[PDB]
Design a protein around this nucleic acid. Structure first.
Ligand SMILES: [Mg+2]
Ligand SMILES: [Zn+2]
Lengths: 516, 52, 45, 47
RNA sequence: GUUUUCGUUGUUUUUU
């Protein structure tokens, strides 16, 4: 457990680094043992330890961070996935700690899947920086932890669930530089996010996420609020300025063009922007006759009108009409009572997608193509798992075949398992297919082994699918990757897919050309 | 049936107004609340009250 | 143990709490709990 | 009352955009009860 | 474990 909760852990690493560098003040302030420091200006000289270790993008991004620091306040530092974000931020923090310009503790908020990671780069790049995570180590115990966490303690780490466990003695005292590695758990305003985040007392505010804008410009305003105190205006002002005109849009374009380029110039110096082959084949299957019957039956019923008028929400009427598109046997009232104890619950050819699943997956089963099966519900996982077990039974009973070897991962499993299964797919010639349910999976899991991808059900977030495709389309993927979309024509899948295309246009004309 | 159908011909009007302003490609199979003449007969024959 | 009989197809069978009400061969959802073979004693008066 | 007329008197220059729906023949079907699992069967009173 | 837990509106038909 690499940490500095107990000063002994700090002392050991400190001594080791001092001995390493050796071959009046805090010793590190002296230049590099074999080279000099990079003096950008009077108040900023990067140590020779890391300055040449960076490269173009990284160096100019740390430069951007220093530029913002001098201009005060901060910005939403977000670019292509993992474009040295951590390296840049820690190098810049080390830069301020080097010139003694850090006069107040730094706070960094990161997910619980990267907690040890975030402490690791501190330990390896800059041992002189002390670090303390917000846990039992780094009710009185956390108060003795508070003792000398501001003078002795340099950087405090926090999980973005853990602030409201000890916020009583954190949000009170002043703070210096602020880092939040989370740009999709802030989104729009009016949430516990703003309740425990935007009450921090520091101009320095930086967010590390390359996907801040995925739903709407309200999320943009709320993300701009955290960094800057409102160079644009209030939420009513932000809306009444350009919310409707952008959506509706000549009569809109030109005035909208100027009103949008004004915003682009207003927020552009507050968030950085940086960016094998892929085949996108979308199959349009039809609703089967038993599916069309259950579709019309639910179509003409009291519950839909009851939802429409207002006593209920449309979220519970489009979840059940997607419940029938996945397969007919999921709108049953006995779902749990026959999910894993009735070997007829799954079935085949009734879903309207088994045939384009059987054929498409068997075209790779004998071809030996590690493929990704993708869902959103753990309930449909039961059906696709019974289906694949029956496929296994059929293949094993006859000959000249090979076991299908699937696996399912979800929130039901533990955080410990993760990488293990994520690895057993890459490093095993067997274990060809495995379902992933692309909500839990996509946090950064390395599954470069896959070369084929099947999308079964369209999602709501247009972003959740890019990580899904990236589960086999990682940067510099070994072999060509293809996407096969399942889409039931003449159904809600049509509306969702067109909606997702419109959402792609939204983030593809706001950031590309506002004349579209 | 006269009663129930006189409250059937009119919900076409009261939906082809909210969409006529949008002039959308209305499905026309969603404005016809077909259970219009199911429930009046069900209630008259079940509860016993011939009306609504 | 708990035996079941179909509607008129005369199919004799036994459902458990894992399947819906469906005569397994005829596909008849009007099924009937098969009578108990157990003896019943009468008074004949 | 076999006549259902709508309109958009304004412009489209000036116009009567006349949505006009005409009624027609009814249809009668034989009893079919349409099970809740798509196993549709013609319905018998005993059932 | 002594002990120990069902109801109403409305509707119809009824009973010397
Ligand atoms: Mg009496
Ligand atoms: Zn039968």
């Amino acid at each position: 457990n690499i940490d500095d909760g107990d000063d002994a852990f700090y002392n050991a690493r400190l001594n080791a680094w001092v001995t390493k560098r050796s071959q009046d003040e805090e010793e590190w302030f002296k230049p590099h043992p074999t080279k000099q420091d990079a003096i950008l200006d009077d108040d900023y000289r990067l140590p020779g330890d890391v300055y040449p270790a960076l490269f173009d993008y990284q160096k100019t991004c740390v430069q951007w961070l220093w530029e913002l620091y001098l201009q005060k306040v901060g910005g939403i530092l977000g670019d292509e996935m993992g474009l040295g974000k951590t390296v840049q931020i820690i190098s810049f923090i080390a830069g301020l700690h080097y010139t003694k310009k850090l006069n107040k503790p730094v706070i960094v908020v990161c997910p619980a899947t990267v907690l040890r990671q975030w402490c690791n780069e501190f330990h390896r790049w800059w041992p002189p920086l002390r670090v303390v995570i917000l846990h039992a180590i780094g009710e009185s115990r956390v108060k003795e932890l508070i003792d000398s966490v501001f003078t002795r303690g340099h950087v405090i780490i926090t999980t973005y669930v853990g602030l409201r466990i000890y916020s009583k003695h954190l949000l009170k005292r002043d703070w210096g530089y602020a880092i939040l590695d989370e740009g999709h758990k802030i989104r729009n305003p009016n949430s516990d996010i703003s309740l425990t985040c935007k009450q921090l007392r520091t101009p320095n505010r930086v967010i590390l996420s390359g996907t801040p804008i995925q739903n709407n410009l309200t999320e943009l305003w709320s993300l701009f609020d955290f960094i800057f105190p409102g160079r644009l205006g209030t939420l009513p002002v932000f809306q009444n300025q350009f919310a409707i005109p952008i959506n509706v849009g000549n009569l809109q374009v030109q005035v909208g063009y100027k009103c949008a380029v004004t915003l682009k110039d207003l927020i552009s110096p507050y968030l950085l922007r940086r960016v094998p082959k892929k085949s996108e084949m979308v199959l349009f299957c039809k609703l089967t006759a038993p599916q069309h019957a259950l579709y019309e039956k639910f179509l003409r019923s009291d519950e839909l009108s009851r939802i429409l008028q207002g006593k209920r929400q449309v979220l519970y009427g489009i979840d059940i009409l997607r419940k029938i598109c996945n397969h007919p046997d999921l709108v049953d009232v006995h779902a749990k009572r026959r999910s894993k104890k009735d070997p007829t619950y799954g079935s085949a050819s009734k879903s309207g997608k088994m045939q384009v699943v059987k054929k498409l997956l068997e075209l790779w089963k004998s071809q030996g193509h590690k493929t990704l099966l993708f869902t959103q519900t753990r309930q449909m996982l039961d059906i696709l798992e019974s289906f694949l077990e029956r496929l296994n039974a059929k293949g094993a009973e006859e000959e000249d075949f090979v076991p299908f070897k699937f696996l399912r991962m979800d929130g039901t499993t533990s955080i410990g398992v993760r990488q293990s299964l994520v690895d057993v797919f890459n490093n095993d010639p067997s274990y060809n297919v495995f379902l992933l349910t692309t909500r839990v999976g996509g946090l950064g899991v390395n599954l470069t082994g896959a070369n084929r991808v099947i999308i079964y059900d369209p999602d709501w977030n247009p972003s959740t699918d890019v990580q899904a495709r990236e589960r086999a389309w990682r940067l510099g993927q070994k072999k060509d990757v293809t996407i096969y979309r399942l889409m039931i024509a003449g159904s809600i899948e049509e509306k969702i897919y067109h909606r997702q295309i419109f959402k792609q246009f939204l983030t593809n004309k706001i950031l590309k050309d506002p004349k579209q | 049936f006269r009663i129930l159908f006189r409250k059937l011909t009119r919900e076409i009007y009261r939906y082809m107004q909210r969409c006529i302003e949008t002039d959308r490609d209305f499905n026309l199979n969603l404005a016809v609340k077909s259970t219009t003449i199911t429930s009046g007969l069900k209630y008259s024959l079940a509860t016993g009250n011939w009306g609504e | 143990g708990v035996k079941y009989t179909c509607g008129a197809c005369a199919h004799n069978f036994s459902l458990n709490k894992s399947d819906p009400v469906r005569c397994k061969e005829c596909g008849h959802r009007v099924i009937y709990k098969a009578r108990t073979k157990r003896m019943i004693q009468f008074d004949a008066r | 009352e076999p006549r259902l007329i709508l309109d958009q008197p304004a412009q489209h220059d000036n116009i009567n955009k006349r949505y006009e729906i005409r009624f027609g023949k009814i249809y009668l079907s034989r009893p079919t009860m349409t099970e809740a699992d798509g196993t549709t069967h013609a319905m018998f009173p005993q059932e």
